[PDB]
Design a binder for this molecule. Structure first.
Ligand code: ACP
Ligand code: CO
Ligand code: CO
Ligand code: CO
Ligand code: CO
Length: 442
């Protein structure tokens, strides 16, 4: 029943760029998103990961965190966390009820001379839940872009920009620098010490746009590979061991229970951000404790061994190519089947090209999202890349995992051919598969 209420709220929200509507809303709410400081995160890849890593580090320094991330894998409750944990279905419905009278008021005034969107409502809910809790610090992931994103009403003292690349596709030719300009809109002038912008690895045309917004906000800049960096990296049971240069010193023997070189870069970004936020040297026992407490559900998360099954939320070519490098470099798979479902706004082809050298075959399917690519359209795309005989189809995710399983069975029984299944292509595919392995939202 808490659950009935939770489905009931999801259903209304699903029946739904200026900042006018979200600003008026926050004003009516009493401006709760200005009652605590925030670390605000934009970029194409790693935003969720970095947000979780940041939350873990601030929690290891003993401040109470609120964290809003997107999209969710399994349950909307995951969008609003307090102390490192999603709020409950009851608190989420309660948070929705508390703000609804003011949302209705904004809907009506706006209609009397455009209702609020689902994301605007979710953002308001997270901000209001943060003030209700109350928290010491909020970690705020951008829904989309940044300049006109619902979250962009906070004037965050730290703004983090993770690697920028292609994800949502409107054109074939890349306006890399128009994309960068919109993300950088989360770098705002401070009201009180200057805004710090903490920037991951970018291509030069991105770098130049980020730098010039930072100028316009008179914002102090910390960029990866100049002001901080991953110095050393070593594969370990469960993850990796890092030696990191932060803003305030070298931190050694950081155990990070996550796979992938890309997660080493997210980690050092999360560190510089938290140093920027507290003004860093941070206590190294706390940095180590925080990184060891990090989880990132549905990002190269191992569901089981024998056979080994991974879910990964890779949905763009840079993500797909980070997934393939990790699978090839940090494991020793003799045989790998991919289970794949992708949404129609993605660079489907660039994903398939990134994964083809690592997947012996791929089973394509439909993840149950209304925005998913239909099985036939994906099998054709996949066929052009893999060749027709390395592509199978299945009606839904559970069938697709059954087909892949018997492919790993057949390969296990084949002496001249340490096997695995990797489920990927979308946040929704990794989230639906995570629910099938029975895991709780996290
Ligand atoms: N720094 C990075 N560079 C390249 N790929 C990365 C990356 N960080 C994460 N990824 C890949 O991107 C996928 C999404 O990571 P997250 O860490 O979820 O990105 P994100 O929040 O920017 C978008 P989303 O949360 O919509 O999936 C991961 O499963 C991983 O494959
Ligand atoms: Co995200
Ligand atoms: Co579009
Ligand atoms: Co000690
Ligand atoms: Co053989």
């Amino acid at each position: 029943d808490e659950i009935a209420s939770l489905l009931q709220v999801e259903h209304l929200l699903d029946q739904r760029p200026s900042l006018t509507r979200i600003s008026a809303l926050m004003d009516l709410l009493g401006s709760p998103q200005r009652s605590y400081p925030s670390i605000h995160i934009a970029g194409t890849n790693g935003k969720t990961s970095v947000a979780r890593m940041v939350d873990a580090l601030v929690t290891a320094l003993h401040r109470r965190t609120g964290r809003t991330t997107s999209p969710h894998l399994q349950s909307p409750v995951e969008r609003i966390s307090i102390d490192g944990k999603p709020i409950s279905p009851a608190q989420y419905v309660a948070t929705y009820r508390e703000i609804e009278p003011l949302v209705a008021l904004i809907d009506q005034q706006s209609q009397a001379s455009p209702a609020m969107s689902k994301f605007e409502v979710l953002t308001a809910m997270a901000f209001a839940a943060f003030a209700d809790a109350p928290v010491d610090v909020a970690v705020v992931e951008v829904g989309m872009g940044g300049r006109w994103d619902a979250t962009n009403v906070i004037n965050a003292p730290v703004a983090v920009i993770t690697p920028i690349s292609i994800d949502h596709v409107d054109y074939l030719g890349a306006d890399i620098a128009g994309i960068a300009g919109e993300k950088a809109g989360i770098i705002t002038r401070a009201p009180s010490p200057d805004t710090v912008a903490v920037i991951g690895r970018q291509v030069p045309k991105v770098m130049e746009v980020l730098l010039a917004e930072s100028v316009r906000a008179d914002a102090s800049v910390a960029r990866e590979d100049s002001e901080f960096a991953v110095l050393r990296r070593q594969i370990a049971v469960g993850g990796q061991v890092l030696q990191l240069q932060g803003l305030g010193g070298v931190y050694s023997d950081i155990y990070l229970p996550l796979h992938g070189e890309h997660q080493a870069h997210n980690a050092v970004l999360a560190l510089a951000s938290v140093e920027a936020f507290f003004g860093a040297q941070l206590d190294g026992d706390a940095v180590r404790a925080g990184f060891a407490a990090v989880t990132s559900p549905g990002r190269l998360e191992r569901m089981r061994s024998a056979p080994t099954v991974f879910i990964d939320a890779a949905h763009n070519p840079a993500g797909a190519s980070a997934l393939a490098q990790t699978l090839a470099h940090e494991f020793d798979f003799r045989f790998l089947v991919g289970v794949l479902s992708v949404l129609g706004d993605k660079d489907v082809d660039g994903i398939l090209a990134a994964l083809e050298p690592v997947f012996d075959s791929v089973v394509v399917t439909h993840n149950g999202s209304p925005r998913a690519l239909d099985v036939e359209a994906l099998a054709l795309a996949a066929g052009e890349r893999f060749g027709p005989d390395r592509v199978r189809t299945a009606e839904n995710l559970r069938d697709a995992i059954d087909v892949a399983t018997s492919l790993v069975d057949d390969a296990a029984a084949d002496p001249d051919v340490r096997t695995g299944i990797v489920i990927t292509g979308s946040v929704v595919t990794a989230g639906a598969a995570r629910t099938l392995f029975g895991r709780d939202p996290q």
